[PDB]
């Protein structure tokens, strides 16, 4: 029963409440216990409680005396219990409660008036119960109640009388999910004082019942309406007619298996701002299908269209000018679809669009013709996502229409070509370009000469070729900050590849083959490709096969903080190499061949660190080579994980395995 300010007793197998806790405890948690009964006599000591979570237990019934000992209680949680009986005195003395959870209590019927005696209640939960009617009392109470949950019940109708108790209550959420409701009575929602949101997830309504619901929702203050998994197979221009008289802003139609969308179906939602259509089965989207939605600010179409079938090849076709009505659209999530391709008028009309995601949106977008994004000429796009589209070729002037583009995501594709440099024309405001996980890329002298504003360039596992050209391909990128060149099997790097990149901060070169470039036997001398990077912060050189470190590689990294050198073949290091690393924070040298750690090389490096990884190193336990290192280990504040588990000497056999 650990407790400093709140009390936790979760999964402690308690049968009775403890009697030794501070008097001024505010939270008392007893989830996942076996409290058969909860006598109130044990609560005399605990008279300062605010939250009382006694859920996931086996309490049969409570007593009103429990509320007497708690004068300031605000939270009462009784999830998954057997409290199937309620009385007027059960919650009589409790009046400051702002939360009441009764989920999965097997409550059958609300008898007379269990919730009259409280007026400050905010949230009430009755999910997973056996209730058949929404009647919670005879008179009107629950003045401040804002959220009411009735999901997973056995309610089959919503009569007007049963909600007469909410004639002056502002309901911000009326959860009625998983209830087989098949009849709606007139005035059922008009009787509610102020209904702001309705949730009917997993409720088998159907199109006609949905229309009846919308008609019953006319001339009310609803703002949200979730109809997820409602078996809404088909919509028409009259399905949402009843919403013409309201100001609905959020509508959810996910998992409804919406086979087709009718013409002018959503013309009755001029105030809609958030529309959801994810995980549907739409086979055809008409030009006027999205008519009347000129105020939507966020549209989701993830898996909204039908998948390909070899039987008929029923690829979901999108008609031209289908998105012309979304004038105020600002976010279009359109991932995991099977569209045949992009047309010249697919995205016409989106004059306020700022985010388009097309991750795996097309079956085969092999070639990015310069006329592909012509429909996005007037769209002020900022972020474009094109991952998992199986793109195989990008022609010149492909992105010449996205003048406002800032982030381009072309990763996780099969792009195999030579970057002539004309593919990036028109990206005057580009900031980040992602190209990782491609087939193979062949850089040229002027590959990135048309995008001087670029700041991020990720090329992880792309099999870079001709990166060792005499003019550095990264020279025009004066504002580059993050560069990733990992898993490219790079062999040759020129010393001037990173020349002029003063603002570079994060550089990744792990999983490459640069061992030869740093050995002293390399013809032409070692390659010092890390000169001039005064602002470099993070360096990654894992699995490079390095066997020798030149003395003056890190001679100018005055602001280096994180350096990675794990999974290498380092055995000896030059003296006085980390002198300029005055602000080093993390040093990684795991899975290396280092046998000696001396102050002459690791002195300045161990000045003020916060992490250290030298686990799988065959250390040599000798006072000439390890005594200083173990002495530094003894007294330090740097975090060294698995210090006593893997920091084991290998030689001599006298100290074989001794930490």
């Amino acid at each position: 029963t650990v407790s400093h300010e709140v009390a936790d007793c979760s999964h402690l197998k308690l049968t009775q409440v403890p009697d030794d806790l501070p008097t001024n405890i505010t939270v008392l948690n007893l989830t996942h216990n076996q409290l058969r009964r909860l006598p109130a006599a044990n609560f005399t000591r605990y008279s300062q409680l605010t939250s009382l979570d006694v859920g996931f237990n086996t309490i049969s019934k409570l007593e009103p005396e429990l509320c007497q000992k708690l004068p300031m209680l605000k939270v009462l949680n009784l999830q998954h219990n057997e409290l199937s009986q309620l009385s007027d005195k059960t919650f009589a003395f409790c009046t400051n409660l702002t939360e009441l959870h009764l989920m999965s209590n097997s409550i059958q019927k609300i008898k007379n008036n269990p919730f009259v005696k409280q007026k400050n209640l905010i949230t009430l939960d009755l999910s997973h119960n056996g209730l058949s009617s929404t009647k919670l009392g005879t008179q009107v109470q629950l003045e401040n109640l804002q959220e009411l949950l009735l999901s997973n019940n056995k309610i089959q109708a919503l009569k007007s009388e049963e909600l007469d108790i909410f004639a002056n209550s502002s309901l911000k959420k009326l959860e009625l999910s998983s209830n087989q409701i098949k009849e709606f009575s007139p005035g059922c929602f008009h009787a509610i004082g102020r209904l702001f949101g309705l949730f009917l997830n997993n409720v088998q309504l159907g199109p006609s019942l949905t229309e009846k619901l919308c008609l019953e929702l006319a001339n009310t203050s609803i703002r949200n309406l979730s109809l997820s998994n409602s078996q809404l197979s088909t919509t028409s221009n009259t399905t949402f007619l009843g919403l013409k008289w309201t100001n609905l802003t959020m509508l959810d139609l996910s998992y409804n298996n919406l086979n087709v969308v009718g013409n002018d179906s959503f013309a009755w939602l001029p105030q809609l701002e958030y529309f959801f259509l994810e995980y549907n089965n739409i086979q055809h989207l008409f030009s006027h299908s999205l008519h009347g939605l000129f105020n939507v600010r966020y549209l989701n179409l993830k898996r909204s269209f039908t998948k390909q079938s070899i039987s008929l090849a029923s690829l979901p076709k999108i008609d031209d000018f289908s998105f012309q009505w979304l004038k105020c659209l600002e976010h279009l999530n359109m991932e995991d679809n099977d569209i045949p391709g992009i047309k010249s008028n697919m995205f016409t009309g989106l004059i306020n669009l700022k985010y388009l995601s097309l991750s795996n949106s097309f079956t085969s977008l092999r070639t990015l013709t310069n006329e592909t994004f012509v429909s996005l000429a007037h769209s002020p796009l900022h972020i474009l996502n094109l991952t998992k589209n199986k793109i195989s070729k990008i022609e010149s002037d492909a992105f010449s229409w996205l003048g406002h583009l800032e982030v381009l995501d072309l990763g996780l594709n099969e792009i195999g070509q030579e970057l002539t440099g004309q593919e990036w024309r028109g990206l005057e405001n580009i900031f980040e370009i992602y190209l990782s996980y491609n087939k193979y890329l062949q850089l040229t002298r002027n590959s990135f000469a048309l995008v001087p504003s670029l700041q991020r360039l990720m090329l992880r596992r792309v099999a870079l070729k001709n990166v060792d050209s005499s003019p550095s391909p990264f020279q025009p990128l004066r504002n580059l900050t993050i560069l990733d060149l990992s898993n490219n099997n790079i062999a040759n790097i020129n010393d001037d590849m990173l020349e002029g990149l003063e603002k570079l901060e994060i550089l990744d070169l792990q999983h490459n083959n640069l061992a030869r470039l740093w050995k002293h036997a390399n013809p032409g001398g070692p390659i010092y490709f890390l000169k001039g990077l005064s602002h470099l912060h993070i360096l990654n050189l894992e699995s490079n096969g390095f066997d020798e470190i030149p003395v003056e590689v890190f001679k100018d990294l005055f602001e280096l903080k994180i350096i990675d050198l794990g999974l290498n073949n380092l055995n000896t290091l030059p003296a006085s190499v980390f002198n300029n690393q005055v602000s080093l924070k993390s040093l990684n040298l795991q899975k290396n061949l280092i046998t000696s750690v001396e102050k002459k090389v690791f002195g300045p490096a161990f000045r003020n660190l916060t992490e250290l990884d030298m686990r799988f190193n065959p250390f040599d336990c000798t006072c000439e080579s390890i005594a200083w290192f173990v002495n530094w280990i003894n007294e330090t504040h740097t975090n060294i994980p698995e210090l006593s588990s893997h920091y084991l000497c290998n030689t001599p056999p006298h100290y074989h395995g001794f930490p």
């Epitope: 009385s87 007379n112 008036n113 008179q139 007007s160 009388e161 004639a167």
Partner: single-chain antibody, 228 residues
């Protein structure tokens, strides 16, 4: 405060309609903080709830199954009244009819009509029938039943020729104006009205009553208290 004035014939021929009117002053018949109802009392029995109506969203009425097929309680919003229409009367309908205000939230009755005696001619709460007490001696009136441990118990006092007076509500609460010597308790399936030092003015009939889920209101048989 609230005045309820009843009016109507005190004599009805059999098989006719018994019509009475309760006129409200100092309150509204459409009030969302009260309910308006009729109960009756014959000397061969105690108190019997007949019907009730309350203005919440639409007009809702609840009737006792004994007279459900005959009774009718309609409000007159234009005149701030409510009526009582009991068809097919029979000398078994001869009784004193009271109109009353049920005060939320306990449905205890704080205001009664003067009562109209009507003659027709051409759950169980159990109380001891009688309790005799000396002046200054504490009186204890018990009330047993299954509603005791499941509902609040109200206690009413009725002097001869007068409407009942609520002396205790919600098993122990005492309305203002009632002497402090009155108190109530509820232990198990037995409620108890204790009159500490019964005075001569406390000699009356005491009825225990409670709310009830199917039948709305249930009254005890009544206990005659005598100050010797």
């Amino acid at each position: 405060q609230v005045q309820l004035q009843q009016s109507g014939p005190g004599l009805v021929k059999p098989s006719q309609t018994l019509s009475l009117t309760c006129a409200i002053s100092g309150d509204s018949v459409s009030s969302n903080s009260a309910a308006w109802g009729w109960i009756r009392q014959s000397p061969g029995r105690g108190l019997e709830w007949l019907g009730i109506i309350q203005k919440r969203s639409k007009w809702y009425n609840n009737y006792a199954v004994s007279v459900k097929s005959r009774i009718t309680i309609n409000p007159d919003t234009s005149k701030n009244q409510f009526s009582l229409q009991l068809n097919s009367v029979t000398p078994e309908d001869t009784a004193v009819y009271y109109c009353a205000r049920y005060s939320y939230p306990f449905y205890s009755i704080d205001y009664w009509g003067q009562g109209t005696l009507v003659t027709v001619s051409s759950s169980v709460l159990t109380q001891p029938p009688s309790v005799s007490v000396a002046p200054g001696q504490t009186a204890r009136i018990s009330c047993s039943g299954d509603n005791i441990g499941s509902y609040y118990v109200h206690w009413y006092q009725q002097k001869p020729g007068q409407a009942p007076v609520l002396v205790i509500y919600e098993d122990s609460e005492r309305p203002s104006g009632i002497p402090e010597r009155f108190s109530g308790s509820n232990s198990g399936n037995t409620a108890t009205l204790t009159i500490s030092g019964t005075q001569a003015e406390d000699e009356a009939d005491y009825y225990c009553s409670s709310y009830d889920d199917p039948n709305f209101q249930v009254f005890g048989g009544g206990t005659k208290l005598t100050v010797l």
